[PDB]
mmCIF file of all heavy atoms in Angstrom:
data_model
loop_
_atom_site.group_PDB
_atom_site.id
_atom_site.type_symbol
_atom_site.label_atom_id
_atom_site.label_comp_id
_atom_site.label_asym_id
_atom_site.label_seq_id
_atom_site.Cartn_x
_atom_site.Cartn_y
_atom_site.Cartn_z
ATOM 1 N N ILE A 1 -32.362 0.012 7.202
ATOM 2 C CA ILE A 1 -31.287 -0.890 7.592
ATOM 3 C C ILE A 1 -31.348 -2.105 6.679
ATOM 4 O O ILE A 1 -32.358 -2.826 6.654
ATOM 5 C CB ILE A 1 -31.388 -1.309 9.067
ATOM 6 C CG1 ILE A 1 -31.272 -0.088 9.980
ATOM 7 C CG2 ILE A 1 -30.321 -2.341 9.402
ATOM 8 C CD1 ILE A 1 -32.580 0.334 10.602
ATOM 9 N N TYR A 2 -30.269 -2.329 5.934
ATOM 10 C CA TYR A 2 -30.161 -3.428 4.987
ATOM 11 C C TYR A 2 -29.098 -4.390 5.497
ATOM 12 O O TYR A 2 -27.993 -3.966 5.839
ATOM 13 C CB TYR A 2 -29.772 -2.908 3.600
ATOM 14 C CG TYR A 2 -30.835 -2.067 2.925
ATOM 15 C CD1 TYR A 2 -30.525 -1.280 1.825
ATOM 16 C CD2 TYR A 2 -32.141 -2.051 3.391
ATOM 17 C CE1 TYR A 2 -31.488 -0.505 1.206
ATOM 18 C CE2 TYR A 2 -33.110 -1.280 2.779
ATOM 19 C CZ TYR A 2 -32.778 -0.511 1.687
ATOM 20 O OH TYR A 2 -33.739 0.260 1.073
ATOM 21 N N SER A 3 -29.417 -5.683 5.550
ATOM 22 C CA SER A 3 -28.532 -6.628 6.216
ATOM 23 C C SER A 3 -28.338 -7.890 5.389
ATOM 24 O O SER A 3 -29.184 -8.261 4.571
ATOM 25 C CB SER A 3 -29.060 -7.010 7.601
ATOM 26 O OG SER A 3 -28.209 -7.955 8.226
ATOM 27 N N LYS A 4 -27.199 -8.542 5.621
ATOM 28 C CA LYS A 4 -26.859 -9.805 4.979
ATOM 29 C C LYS A 4 -25.883 -10.567 5.866
ATOM 30 O O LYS A 4 -25.087 -9.970 6.596
ATOM 31 C CB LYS A 4 -26.255 -9.585 3.586
ATOM 32 C CG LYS A 4 -26.160 -10.846 2.740
ATOM 33 C CD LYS A 4 -27.533 -11.322 2.297
ATOM 34 C CE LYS A 4 -27.446 -12.660 1.581
ATOM 35 N NZ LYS A 4 -26.649 -12.569 0.327
ATOM 36 N N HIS A 5 -25.952 -11.896 5.792
ATOM 37 C CA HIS A 5 -25.104 -12.787 6.573
ATOM 38 C C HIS A 5 -24.368 -13.742 5.642
ATOM 39 O O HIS A 5 -24.934 -14.212 4.649
ATOM 40 C CB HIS A 5 -25.931 -13.581 7.590
ATOM 41 C CG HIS A 5 -25.105 -14.404 8.529
ATOM 42 N ND1 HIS A 5 -24.692 -15.684 8.230
ATOM 43 C CD2 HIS A 5 -24.622 -14.131 9.764
ATOM 44 C CE1 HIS A 5 -23.986 -16.163 9.239
ATOM 45 N NE2 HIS A 5 -23.929 -15.242 10.183
ATOM 46 N N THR A 6 -23.103 -14.028 5.963
ATOM 47 C CA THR A 6 -22.294 -14.889 5.109
ATOM 48 C C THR A 6 -21.338 -15.734 5.939
ATOM 49 O O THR A 6 -20.755 -15.227 6.909
ATOM 50 C CB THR A 6 -21.499 -14.062 4.091
ATOM 51 O OG1 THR A 6 -22.377 -13.142 3.429
ATOM 52 C CG2 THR A 6 -20.853 -14.960 3.049
ATOM 53 N N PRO A 7 -21.169 -17.016 5.607
ATOM 54 C CA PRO A 7 -20.114 -17.815 6.248
ATOM 55 C C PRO A 7 -18.786 -17.639 5.520
ATOM 56 O O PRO A 7 -18.700 -17.830 4.304
ATOM 57 C CB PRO A 7 -20.633 -19.252 6.131
ATOM 58 C CG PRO A 7 -21.499 -19.236 4.915
ATOM 59 C CD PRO A 7 -22.065 -17.842 4.776
ATOM 60 N N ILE A 8 -17.749 -17.272 6.274
ATOM 61 C CA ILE A 8 -16.430 -16.992 5.722
ATOM 62 C C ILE A 8 -15.407 -17.823 6.486
ATOM 63 O O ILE A 8 -15.597 -18.161 7.656
ATOM 64 C CB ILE A 8 -16.093 -15.484 5.792
ATOM 65 C CG1 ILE A 8 -17.145 -14.669 5.040
ATOM 66 C CG2 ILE A 8 -14.749 -15.194 5.164
ATOM 67 C CD1 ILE A 8 -17.234 -15.003 3.567
ATOM 68 N N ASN A 9 -14.309 -18.159 5.808
ATOM 69 C CA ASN A 9 -13.289 -19.056 6.345
ATOM 70 C C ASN A 9 -11.895 -18.451 6.197
ATOM 71 O O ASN A 9 -10.953 -19.104 5.742
ATOM 72 C CB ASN A 9 -13.361 -20.421 5.665
ATOM 73 C CG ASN A 9 -12.674 -21.510 6.467
ATOM 74 O OD1 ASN A 9 -12.141 -21.260 7.548
ATOM 75 N ND2 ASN A 9 -12.682 -22.728 5.938
ATOM 76 N N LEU A 10 -11.744 -17.187 6.578
ATOM 77 C CA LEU A 10 -10.438 -16.544 6.641
ATOM 78 C C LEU A 10 -10.049 -16.317 8.100
ATOM 79 O O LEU A 10 -10.802 -16.632 9.026
ATOM 80 C CB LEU A 10 -10.429 -15.228 5.853
ATOM 81 C CG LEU A 10 -11.484 -14.151 6.126
ATOM 82 C CD1 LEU A 10 -11.111 -13.269 7.309
ATOM 83 C CD2 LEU A 10 -11.690 -13.302 4.880
ATOM 84 N N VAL A 11 -8.857 -15.758 8.300
ATOM 85 C CA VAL A 11 -8.337 -15.457 9.632
ATOM 86 C C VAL A 11 -8.389 -13.957 9.928
ATOM 87 O O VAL A 11 -8.993 -13.531 10.915
ATOM 88 C CB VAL A 11 -6.912 -16.031 9.823
ATOM 89 C CG1 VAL A 11 -5.960 -15.563 8.725
ATOM 90 C CG2 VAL A 11 -6.373 -15.659 11.197
ATOM 91 N N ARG A 12 -7.759 -13.136 9.083
ATOM 92 C CA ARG A 12 -7.832 -11.681 9.229
ATOM 93 C C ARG A 12 -7.687 -11.078 7.831
ATOM 94 O O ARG A 12 -6.574 -10.817 7.369
ATOM 95 C CB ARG A 12 -6.764 -11.163 10.181
ATOM 96 C CG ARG A 12 -6.845 -9.672 10.454
ATOM 97 C CD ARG A 12 -5.741 -9.220 11.396
ATOM 98 N NE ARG A 12 -4.413 -9.444 10.831
ATOM 99 C CZ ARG A 12 -3.793 -8.592 10.021
ATOM 100 N NH1 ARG A 12 -4.380 -7.453 9.677
ATOM 101 N NH2 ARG A 12 -2.586 -8.877 9.553
ATOM 102 N N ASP A 13 -8.823 -10.840 7.181
ATOM 103 C CA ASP A 13 -8.864 -10.318 5.822
ATOM 104 C C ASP A 13 -10.269 -9.795 5.550
ATOM 105 O O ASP A 13 -11.154 -9.855 6.407
ATOM 106 C CB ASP A 13 -8.469 -11.385 4.794
ATOM 107 C CG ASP A 13 -6.974 -11.442 4.550
ATOM 108 O OD1 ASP A 13 -6.328 -10.373 4.556
ATOM 109 O OD2 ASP A 13 -6.444 -12.556 4.352
ATOM 110 N N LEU A 14 -10.465 -9.277 4.338
ATOM 111 C CA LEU A 14 -11.776 -8.853 3.870
ATOM 112 C C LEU A 14 -12.263 -9.843 2.825
ATOM 113 O O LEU A 14 -11.577 -10.047 1.812
ATOM 114 C CB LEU A 14 -11.718 -7.440 3.290
ATOM 115 C CG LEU A 14 -13.047 -6.709 3.079
ATOM 116 C CD1 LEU A 14 -12.883 -5.224 3.349
ATOM 117 C CD2 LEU A 14 -13.581 -6.933 1.672
ATOM 118 N N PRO A 15 -13.413 -10.487 3.030
ATOM 119 C CA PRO A 15 -13.855 -11.529 2.094
ATOM 120 C C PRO A 15 -14.045 -10.989 0.684
ATOM 121 O O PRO A 15 -14.479 -9.853 0.483
ATOM 122 C CB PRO A 15 -15.182 -12.003 2.697
ATOM 123 C CG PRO A 15 -15.077 -11.661 4.148
ATOM 124 C CD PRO A 15 -14.307 -10.374 4.194
ATOM 125 N N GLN A 16 -13.713 -11.824 -0.297
ATOM 126 C CA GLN A 16 -13.852 -11.467 -1.701
ATOM 127 C C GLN A 16 -15.259 -11.818 -2.181
ATOM 128 O O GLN A 16 -16.145 -12.166 -1.394
ATOM 129 C CB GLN A 16 -12.777 -12.162 -2.531
ATOM 130 C CG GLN A 16 -11.353 -11.827 -2.118
ATOM 131 C CD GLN A 16 -10.957 -10.414 -2.494
ATOM 132 O OE1 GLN A 16 -10.906 -10.065 -3.673
ATOM 133 N NE2 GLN A 16 -10.673 -9.592 -1.490
ATOM 134 N N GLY A 17 -15.481 -11.729 -3.490
ATOM 135 C CA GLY A 17 -16.760 -12.081 -4.067
ATOM 136 C C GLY A 17 -17.774 -10.958 -3.982
ATOM 137 O O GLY A 17 -17.519 -9.865 -3.473
ATOM 138 N N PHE A 18 -18.965 -11.249 -4.500
ATOM 139 C CA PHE A 18 -20.070 -10.303 -4.525
ATOM 140 C C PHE A 18 -21.286 -10.931 -3.861
ATOM 141 O O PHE A 18 -21.572 -12.115 -4.065
ATOM 142 C CB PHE A 18 -20.411 -9.884 -5.960
ATOM 143 C CG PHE A 18 -21.483 -8.836 -6.049
ATOM 144 C CD1 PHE A 18 -21.180 -7.500 -5.847
ATOM 145 C CD2 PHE A 18 -22.791 -9.185 -6.337
ATOM 146 C CE1 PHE A 18 -22.163 -6.534 -5.930
ATOM 147 C CE2 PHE A 18 -23.779 -8.224 -6.420
ATOM 148 C CZ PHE A 18 -23.464 -6.895 -6.216
ATOM 149 N N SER A 19 -21.998 -10.135 -3.066
ATOM 150 C CA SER A 19 -23.174 -10.620 -2.357
ATOM 151 C C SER A 19 -24.242 -9.539 -2.352
ATOM 152 O O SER A 19 -23.940 -8.368 -2.102
ATOM 153 C CB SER A 19 -22.825 -11.028 -0.922
ATOM 154 O OG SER A 19 -23.996 -11.245 -0.154
ATOM 155 N N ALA A 20 -25.481 -9.934 -2.628
ATOM 156 C CA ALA A 20 -26.595 -9.001 -2.571
ATOM 157 C C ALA A 20 -26.930 -8.664 -1.122
ATOM 158 O O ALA A 20 -26.665 -9.437 -0.197
ATOM 159 C CB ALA A 20 -27.821 -9.582 -3.276
ATOM 160 N N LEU A 21 -27.522 -7.490 -0.931
ATOM 161 C CA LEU A 21 -27.833 -6.971 0.400
ATOM 162 C C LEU A 21 -29.341 -6.748 0.481
ATOM 163 O O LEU A 21 -29.844 -5.702 0.061
ATOM 164 C CB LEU A 21 -27.059 -5.687 0.667
ATOM 165 C CG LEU A 21 -27.213 -5.046 2.042
ATOM 166 C CD1 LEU A 21 -26.696 -5.983 3.111
ATOM 167 C CD2 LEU A 21 -26.471 -3.733 2.087
ATOM 168 N N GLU A 22 -30.056 -7.728 1.027
ATOM 169 C CA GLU A 22 -31.509 -7.653 1.064
ATOM 170 C C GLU A 22 -31.969 -6.656 2.128
ATOM 171 O O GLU A 22 -31.317 -6.506 3.163
ATOM 172 C CB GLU A 22 -32.107 -9.031 1.349
ATOM 173 C CG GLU A 22 -31.972 -10.017 0.203
ATOM 174 C CD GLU A 22 -31.777 -11.443 0.681
ATOM 175 O OE1 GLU A 22 -31.333 -11.631 1.834
ATOM 176 O OE2 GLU A 22 -32.066 -12.377 -0.096
ATOM 177 N N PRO A 23 -33.085 -5.957 1.897
ATOM 178 C CA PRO A 23 -33.612 -5.039 2.917
ATOM 179 C C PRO A 23 -34.093 -5.754 4.170
ATOM 180 O O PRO A 23 -34.988 -6.601 4.096
ATOM 181 C CB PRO A 23 -34.781 -4.339 2.211
ATOM 182 C CG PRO A 23 -34.606 -4.582 0.765
ATOM 183 C CD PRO A 23 -33.631 -5.695 0.553
ATOM 184 N N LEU A 24 -33.512 -5.423 5.325
ATOM 185 C CA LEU A 24 -33.991 -6.011 6.570
ATOM 186 C C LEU A 24 -35.181 -5.237 7.127
ATOM 187 O O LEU A 24 -36.220 -5.829 7.445
ATOM 188 C CB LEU A 24 -32.861 -6.096 7.601
ATOM 189 C CG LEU A 24 -33.179 -6.877 8.887
ATOM 190 C CD1 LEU A 24 -31.954 -7.597 9.411
ATOM 191 C CD2 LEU A 24 -33.728 -5.971 9.979
ATOM 192 N N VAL A 25 -35.061 -3.914 7.254
ATOM 193 C CA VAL A 25 -36.105 -3.123 7.900
ATOM 194 C C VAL A 25 -36.005 -1.679 7.434
ATOM 195 O O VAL A 25 -34.959 -1.230 6.962
ATOM 196 C CB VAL A 25 -36.001 -3.235 9.444
ATOM 197 C CG1 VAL A 25 -34.825 -2.429 9.962
ATOM 198 C CG2 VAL A 25 -37.305 -2.811 10.115
ATOM 199 N N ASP A 26 -37.116 -0.948 7.551
ATOM 200 C CA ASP A 26 -37.197 0.473 7.212
ATOM 201 C C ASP A 26 -37.970 1.155 8.341
ATOM 202 O O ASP A 26 -39.200 1.248 8.290
ATOM 203 C CB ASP A 26 -37.868 0.674 5.852
ATOM 204 C CG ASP A 26 -37.788 2.109 5.357
ATOM 205 O OD1 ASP A 26 -37.768 3.042 6.184
ATOM 206 O OD2 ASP A 26 -37.743 2.302 4.124
#
């Protein structure tokens, strides 16, 4: 399970940009 958290400021859309996904647990 790989997880990431991000603060976003849209209403109903898919956030743009690129973000790494660090390993949470195996």
Side-chain angles (χ1 to χ4, degrees):
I1 298 106
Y2 293 165
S3 179
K4 193 70 186 297
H5 186 273
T6 310
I8 302 299
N9 199 0
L10 53 83
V11 54
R12 184 181 62 86
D13 272 323
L14 195 145
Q16 301 288 297
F18 184 81
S19 168
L21 183 63
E22 289 146 338
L24 188 146
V25 74
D26 189 329

